[PDB]
């Protein structure tokens, strides 16, 4: 399965994905890394790994739809089969999501449905939970609302801050996001006709 990773920043999930997909049993190959922000560290990791990179500036297109069109163009250019959002901080248009329905995974740093949205760790700490975690899910139109693929619980420790909580969660992310990719790329998991998660 040919895979694209969309990033916006440091790219440590990208790195975890690269690491698993070079294992010989990997059913995924990362063929392109696409970032909407230049000079971010995820682009270095991708170039250090030998993976082609493209930077699409969302300040050169008029529409969200024109912008995703540019991404889709690159995905088609590289004959991509699966799209992994690994720290992509931009919301995708409805038609783009429709076209990739069932082929696009996202890593979100909470136990969904808790703490949808962009500041999940802040939500978790404000709420006062003693357990949080991360989720890999298919991207549906409603944000952080697609079919869940994997989750891993992570403890919240006393005095945690966003810094320390997200450090702990990210170790879990580097576990379940490569596993989730591998489930989907091997055809073990798909999105069923009924749109629920389909094990095979
Ligand atoms: N349809 C759909 N799309 C998507 S994308 C995704 C990955 C995580 C999204 C995190 C996220 C939560 S809010 C937000 C935001 O407001 N971004 C600004 C750009 C901000 C900037 O660049 O400064 C903007 O999109 O304009 C995000 F980026 C999941 C997902 C999904 O489930 N459904
Ligand atoms: N709402 C989406 C969101 O918060 N994504 C989060 O951004 C980070 C990207 O880190 P990385 O660039 O080191 O992989 C990850 O921690 C992921 O959970």
Author numbering: 808 to 1007
Article passage:
Interestingly, PMX is a multitargeted antifolate that also inhibits the folate-dependent reactions catalyzed by glycinamide ribonucleotide (GAR) formyltransferase (GARFTase) (in the trifunctional GARFTase/glycinamide ribonucleotide synthase (GARS)/aminoimidazole ribonucleotide synthetase (AIRS) enzyme) and 5-aminoimidazole-4-carboxamide ribonucleotide formyltransferase (AICARFTase) (in the bifunctional enzyme AICARFTase/inosine monophosphate cyclohydrolase (ATIC)) in de novo purine biosynthesis. Although all these antifolates are used clinically, their use is often associated with dose-limiting toxicities arising from the lack of tumor selectivity, as well as emergence of drug resistance. By metabolite rescue in KB cells and in vitro enzyme assays, de novo purine biosynthesis was identified as a targeted pathway (at 5-aminoimidazole-4-carboxamide ribonucleotide formyltransferase (AICARFTase) and glycinamide ribonucleotide formyltransferase (GARFTase)). To better understand the molecular effects of modifications to 6-substituted thieno[2,3-d]pyrimidine analogs on GARFTase inhibition, we determined the structures of select analogs (4, 5, 9, and 10) with a range of inhibitor potencies in complex with GARFTase and β-GAR substrate. The thieno[2,3-d]pyrimidine scaffold of all analogs makes polar contacts with the backbone atoms of Leu899, Glu948, and Asp951 in GARFTase.
Our in vitro results demonstrate that compound 9 is a uniquely potent inhibitor of human GARFTase. The most potent analog, 9 (0.17 μM), is a fluorinated thieno compound with the fluorine positioned to make an intramolecular contact with the amide hydrogen of the l-glutamate moiety (as predicted from NMR and molecular docking), thus restricting the side chain. The α-carboxylate of the l-glutamate of 9 is stabilized in the GARFTase active site by contacts with the side chain of Arg871, as well as the backbone amide of Ile898. Compound 9 is 882-fold more inhibitory toward GARFTase than the corresponding des-fluoro 11, indicating the importance of the fluorine for GARFTase inhibition in this structural motif. Compound 9 showed a Ki of 0.17 μM (17-, 25-, and 882-fold more potent than 2, 10, and 11, respectively). Compound 10, a nonfluorinated 3-C bridged thieno compound, is ∼25-fold less active than 9 in GARFTase inhibition and exhibits the same contacts between the l-glutamate and GARFTase as those seen for 9. This implies that fluorination in 9 relative to the closely related nonfluorinated compounds 10 and 11 may bias the conformation prior to binding GARFTase, thereby reducing its entropic penalty upon binding (i.e., leading to increased potency).
